[PDB]
Amino acid sequence: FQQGLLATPVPAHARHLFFTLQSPEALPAALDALLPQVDGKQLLLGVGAPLAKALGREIPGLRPFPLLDAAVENPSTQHALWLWLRGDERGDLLLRTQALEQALAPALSLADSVDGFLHRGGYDLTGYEDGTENPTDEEAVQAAIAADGSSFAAFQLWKHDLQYFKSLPQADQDNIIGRRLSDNEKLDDAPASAHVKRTAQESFEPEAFMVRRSVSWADQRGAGLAFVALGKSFEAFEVQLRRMSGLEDGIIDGLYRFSRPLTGGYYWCPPMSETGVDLSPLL
Amino acid sequence: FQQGLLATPVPAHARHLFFTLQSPEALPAALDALLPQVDGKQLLLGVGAPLAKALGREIPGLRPFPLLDAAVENPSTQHALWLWLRGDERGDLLLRTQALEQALAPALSLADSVDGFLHRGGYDLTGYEDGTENPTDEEAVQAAIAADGSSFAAFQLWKHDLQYFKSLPQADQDNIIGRRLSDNEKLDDAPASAHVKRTAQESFEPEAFMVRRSVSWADQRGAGLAFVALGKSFEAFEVQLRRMSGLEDGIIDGLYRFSRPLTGGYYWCPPMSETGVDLSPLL
Amino acid sequence: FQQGLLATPVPAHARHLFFTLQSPEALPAALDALLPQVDGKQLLLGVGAPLAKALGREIPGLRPFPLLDAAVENPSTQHALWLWLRGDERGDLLLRTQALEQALAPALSLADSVDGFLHRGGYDLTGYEDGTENPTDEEAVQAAIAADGSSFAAFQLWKHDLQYFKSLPQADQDNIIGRRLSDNEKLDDAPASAHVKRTAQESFEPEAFMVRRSVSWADQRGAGLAFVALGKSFEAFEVQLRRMSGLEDGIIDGLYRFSRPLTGGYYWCPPMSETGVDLSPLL
Amino acid sequence: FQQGLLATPVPAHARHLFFTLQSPEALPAALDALLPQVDGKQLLLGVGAPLAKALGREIPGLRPFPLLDAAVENPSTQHALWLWLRGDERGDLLLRTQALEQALAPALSLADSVDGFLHRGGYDLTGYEDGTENPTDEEAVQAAIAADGSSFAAFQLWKHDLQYFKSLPQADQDNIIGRRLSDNEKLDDAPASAHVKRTAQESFEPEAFMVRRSVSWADQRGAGLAFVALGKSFEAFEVQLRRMSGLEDGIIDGLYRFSRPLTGGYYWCPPMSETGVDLSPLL
């Protein structure tokens, strides 16, 4: 089985941590201290491509975050290790992060972190509902979980310009998203650049279905959406990001008019075994 | 012809600005206010790959910062426009940044900025001399300036861990860089991982000579080196970075033990016409 | 008559906003848009001493945060207006801050804000339960609410050093607080510097009882406690603060070993009428 | 005998450090590492009132930064120790800051830091010349240095609103400062609220002369003026600050329209001996 990547009572808070491998000499000491804490429910783990190449192994399906030569900027800030903390107590995530940061401190240094929260029941700070057309029970498992229970997650930290977006007329805001804010109805007559029209999961030659487990965030860098896209492989995420960037037809997604990603990373989520997390292909 | 990006009377302070193209409709209005201010001496301009693709043009040799599938992390955060301010008055550069930011307001939003300074007469906060094996005048013009007067500049914001690096014995510090700090003399018996052994400009299939116009920086993100590599094209910088990343010999550069890059970008510096900067291949 | 300063089921999140009066000419336009939003439950209001001086009025019992010439540092950063936002959704409070800053735009500018949350059910990030010896029910109206529904609130933003505190032995942590962490029982044999020994509400003349409604916080300034002390006037808070600073017996509270306040302010919470909040003593 | 607080060629860069006394037991070991480095030229020393109270000593003339019950906000953020770094190399001050906090670490913790610079030859970021009517030559020693080598310095970190100030008509800007920007001539017909009208050194009951050694600053907190007022006592600064706040006549200084202080502190600068700094009244 995988990790608790699909539990439908999604916690009110999240904490994403990203680590750089600085000293591979003390890496075994850090992993022996880390793996017994990964239960897949409150602490989830993803392995990056630099961590695979550092250990000489190559996990099937894993590769760095792609480089898209487009008119919009999708930065590739690939890290070695990704920790995903989920809980209802915002203080509990903070206290463990200080424990985890000290736990891996010889081998891994903290490169970036995001204090996430679930706005209302699941919304982006812009007011639009996030997760409407997300698949549900078992439809998630076909889309997000691989044959062996591993999953492949794409991470992007999007920074919103909430002041500029909320200053536009509602009719123009709706043409940017592709759905009406008042009742969450798809705008059939929206421009081709509308977000829902760009990412229509049924509008690809494989039904590029993914599971989105994003949360909202806010700190000194501003505020936006911590986008997390799970897939049985990275192709569902990548073909959509290429269409959003105008690399398929020349039409760029409307989200880039008010929001831009600061971070980009691909991570392999190993399966959950009976002794713990299954990092056997990597050790 | 060329810009004054090589004048060895180097100013004491620098400011690097990076912009994202958010509304291409107002782009001509922004270019009209910017180009008359770019004299190549106190204000330099660099065009990014997304800016060319946004205009449907194709500059030969221009492409985004590469994506290296290596054991160390070299991020690619390519932006549309790069502005390089150089001056002796740190406050003057600050006031000009707010002026530039308002003049490009609707079309380009400020994505990243770096407050740089020339440490001592040219050293890295670690104390080592920076620019020792840099080519000099006339010897530079063939190595750093392209055939048509334009240059291809690579930018990386490196973040030092001065506390850890300066906590190591003086012998280990010298083996990481490859030179003795006391007199800046190459250690021929250093390990193959030494930075100077990795970056020996004569040990490539062309003598990959570049011009390094780097400055030190310090703000809330920490402190380090704002690396700037000029070249007649990007091959010199790329073959160097691949060897440092262990993509050529499997030996990783020792810089990654204490320093890591946060950003990465390729930029095309257009030649100076006599109207000003020559953006003819872009119109 | 009072605001909802005493409701026991404390919401999971809070936001404290502090404003400086920049343009008193636009104050009438700002107050008419702000006062109908103060219900005392989800938005609470406190008036600072500078706001009284700006209107030439004199509120009985109101004054700036005191100046303690002590061996410890208690800052006095008194502001004009204090807005206290309470809610269960961390995202809603953030969006209302952007709404509140604009409605008060020309007259009042944001001087400081705090993103607060109730750790567990009411605990300090150090793990100790906060609010054990708070008064119960009507005893809080006797101690925190003045004659006319109004209250006098003291605000301090304390910054913890959780790394240092958690490294001490458990008995040293217990001797600093004055309670044992394992069962939350008072250490009668604790040193005179233990926090509970310093602020024992019955050990003063007269009995300095207050109601504390503090929440935990964490951002780029660190993490700590947003201390809020409610009293029928400021004498209870001040006499306790003076004993903690050693101005009564020479013994400094043990909290200053790992925590220090960053801000300090006295505010007058006006009574709640059936038309709204009563600013008649201020017009 | 005095420190170099009056040298006319003021260095291009400054760095102000402020420390909180956390463990007074390790204070001797910290002072033993600090006093041999205080030469009064590149590293200057100011002692705060809390440091005197912690040692049970009492310096004549020293007291905490006052608390002014006015309509404007002047914070009192007194600290135990003030270190003033001056130099022409911005990077040298950065490295000494890490070295200093390392040496004073167990006893004193860093409470605040400012990265200052001298804009032009002595201007405020608004463009007005700063330091015109500072006394010169022999007149500074009678105004800034007491009967012994000691001076008494007041520090305030003012945060400017450069965007708002430069949007005002030039005559409104001139009426706020009280001097014309075109030639730096006093406007005798300016309103009584003009800054130069409030602080006219010869319009007090003694000719309240002080020596101002302020620099400009700019970081994440914004930008403004790091105000440093030197006097043989705090009486010159205090009576002026009280007039600017409208506590003497009711007229508030025009600086508060666009600028506000973030910090406030009084510091005693000990006399300089030929063995070091003389802290004998402190032992």
Ligand code: HEM
């Ligand atoms: C700031 C960034 C983003 C925001 C605010 C955002 C928000 C939304 C919203 C409001 C919807 C409509 C409601 C729903 O169907 O869930 C939606 C749909 C969707 N989004 Fe985005 N999203 C963002 C980034 C992305 C990215 C980077 C991708 C993929 C690379 C993506 C993929 C999708 C998909 C597949 C749908 C399904 C809609 C459908 O098929 O009907 N989103 N998003």
Ligand code: HEM
């Ligand atoms: C933390 C980042 C860096 C530090 C601290 C650093 C510092 C140094 C130092 C001290 C030297 C020896 C003296 C000198 O040439 O100035 C050197 C050599 C050199 N470095 Fe770097 N550098 C950094 C990044 C880079 C990168 C990323 C590249 C190329 C991709 C580069 C290219 C070179 C070259 C071409 C030399 C020539 C040395 C020779 O040919 O003997 N530098 N570096």
Ligand code: HEM
């Ligand atoms: C970082 C700052 C502070 C922390 C972490 C803290 C924490 C605590 C804790 C854990 C207790 C024991 C449990 C309880 O009675 O709630 C306590 C007691 C108390 N504290 Fe604090 N406190 C802080 C600041 C203050 C300040 C500044 C004051 C007053 C000026 C204060 C007033 C009190 C009072 C009145 C009690 C009553 C305890 C008794 O009567 O037994 N607290 N505090």
Ligand code: HEM
């Ligand atoms: C953001 C804060 C401040 C700014 C931008 C500022 C700027 C100026 C300027 C441009 C002048 C005219 C030329 C000069 O004397 O330098 C001046 C005059 C003066 N300033 Fe300020 N000042 C500030 C704060 C203060 C404060 C708080 C005090 C005293 C408590 C003070 C003391 C004085 C005095 C005594 C003069 C007399 C000059 C004369 O009589 O010719 N300054 N100020």
